[PDB]
Design a binder for this molecule. Sequence first.
Ligand SMILES: CC(=O)N[C@@H]1[C@@H](O)[C@H](O)[C@@H](CO)O[C@H]1O
Ligand SMILES: [Ca+2]
Ligand SMILES: [Cu+2]
Length: 751
Amino acid sequence: QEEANYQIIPLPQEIVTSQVNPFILKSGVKILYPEGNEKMQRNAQFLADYLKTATGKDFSIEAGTEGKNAIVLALGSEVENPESYQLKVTDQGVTITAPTEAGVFYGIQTLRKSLPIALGADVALPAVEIKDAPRFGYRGAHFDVSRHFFTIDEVKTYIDMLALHNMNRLHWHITDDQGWRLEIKKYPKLTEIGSQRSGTVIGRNSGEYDNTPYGGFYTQEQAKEIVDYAAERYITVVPEIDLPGHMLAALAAYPELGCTGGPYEVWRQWGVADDVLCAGNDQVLKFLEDVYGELIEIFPSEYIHVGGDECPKVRWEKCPKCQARIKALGLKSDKNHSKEERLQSFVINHIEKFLNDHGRQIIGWDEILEGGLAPNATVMSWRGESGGIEAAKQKHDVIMTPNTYLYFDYYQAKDTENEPFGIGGYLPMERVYSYEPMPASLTPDEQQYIKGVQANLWTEYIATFSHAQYMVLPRWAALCEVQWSTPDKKNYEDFLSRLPRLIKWYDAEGYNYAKHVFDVKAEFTPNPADGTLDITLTTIDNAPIHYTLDGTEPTSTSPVYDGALKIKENADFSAIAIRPTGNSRVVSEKIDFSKSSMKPIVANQPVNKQYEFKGVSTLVDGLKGNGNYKTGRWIAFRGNDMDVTIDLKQPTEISSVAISTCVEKGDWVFDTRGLSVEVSEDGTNFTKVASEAYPAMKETDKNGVYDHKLTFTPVTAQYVKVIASPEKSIPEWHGGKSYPGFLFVDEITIN
Ligand SMILES: CC(=O)N[C@@H]1[C@@H](O)[C@H](O)[C@@H](CO)O[C@H]1O
Ligand SMILES: [Ca+2]
Ligand SMILES: [Cu+2]
């Protein structure tokens, strides 16, 4: 028999539990909703759908206030927070009570996420009282459907994914330079021409082009379908028709809207286009009024996103019409703004006034601060937090989407080679979760202007919905705890222990996701005291870890990890986590163990401060490095030799010393010019037993790892001094001729 678990994502405010019998969830149980409430009937059908993917069973939906062996949805308690709820469980029944139908829905999402996926099985719901409410009223995700186009069905899946994470906003970015995606009745060419490009660039603007005509748009009926589908799941769809930049698709369709007058093409490549709407053209203002006039008939959202990001002023500076507008308005350059930044403020003010007259407010990207903020504008801070902080100080509402924390087109792993191709950056789960949306630099009163938190998905490098899921799951799980949970409840270790129960729902709903959190985490800790390299292995779900030391594939039949592996000998280490769902990536490490490994070592000359890492002890930990000299497997020397003494602890017969170096000549990192081995009985007086000089490197020599080994007549020694020269004088062919080069070394092996 299965048991429910209320330790879910996002973590509720208040969870109690008692020593009373649980509620058994078997065939016969009913869901009750208030007579004649369409939303609460839809809430009941949602619970039934969820209970059907969790248990294998159907549960009847019926009108009612009262029932034995029943789950009762009802309205009640305070309206302080409209999205709050109360989930009480006894052996007799289940109550989900909220001040609105949306609060009942988030109460239902909590019951949903508490359940395991166990087909054919009855489930025990332990006796509990859950009081919960979101911290932020605006909890959103953005979706770029211009750069690559996504179908109605894919956008609905995105909306189902929002609901599972208690998010109440879809920011729908439906126009840009590379495609216009909404049918407009007055301007048919916005879709006939504006929705089509000749092809798409390959890689990061590489000059190679995929000459496949690419396009797609939504009809006004299809866009209404999305509004309605989102509205059932208590999600407001905030549309963005980005202006006055990111408008090449509109210019291709109607070139008179641009400063030069064309020619313009729908853009095949990525980045920022200089060709923007002409602020000096009365046709452009009429055009925006007409487009936004049609937009607000489709999208009832009180808030409408006008964009305002990355609008270069270069065309405006040279345009006689834009300069005539500037002259007539008396716009001036001062320390706060250029004339052309004041001209942008005029455009944002014009569309705000039109939308305020039709009962709507505007959101803009933090660039709308340029030339003075529109008096009623909400600011979406994306260029870090600083735009939001300045907006809050001017008493304007802020939605935080900082690219330092919440740009989910960025890589979510350091090892970008093994990731799907992306724009760049590094936003791992831990970084996303560490985000505190309320800046420490704002006064309490200024903090009330932080209304929302949202993560953006730009799709320059996202062509499939499966890859879009990979990029947002499970990073949305971290985001939604930030959006929802109180800041004092946040603990990263605890969140990661809750994540696997949410991934089970990703699996059951057929959602793709990144699997980095499921990896075996390996720590290699030197133990000088014991003369061992201690390997510790962990998973977030504490799944069974199987390992090999002999270089064979680790399987379900290999030895099981029981506690620290104390390595005292050569080893091809490999470990894997065994999971019903599918096995983890294999974590592996070559352990090069010798007479030097975990022995005391001293620097006789200085280690380079910049590339010191864990220090000289790095050269006797049994670990080797690769071509990348920045990992901490390598320590560097510059302006003096690697000159170290290793204490073998007692007199010992030795016959060889081996090192590796890391070469990157472009970075002034060169191979050693000579290696030497001296021995002592007393630790003061050393005698040379072997050496070799290496010639200066030539232009055609490879970068990467070089191996250097000296053999010699067996000799008895307690102390071994190993000396390696860097390049004191970089050779003539190289730009740094005569300057000293870096030397990087990873390990001193002695046998
Ligand atoms: C407000 C904003 O972010 N604008 C652009 C966006 O078109 C682009 O896709 C993204 C890259 O991550 O960032 C900026 O270049
Ligand atoms: Ca090492
Ligand atoms: Cu112009």
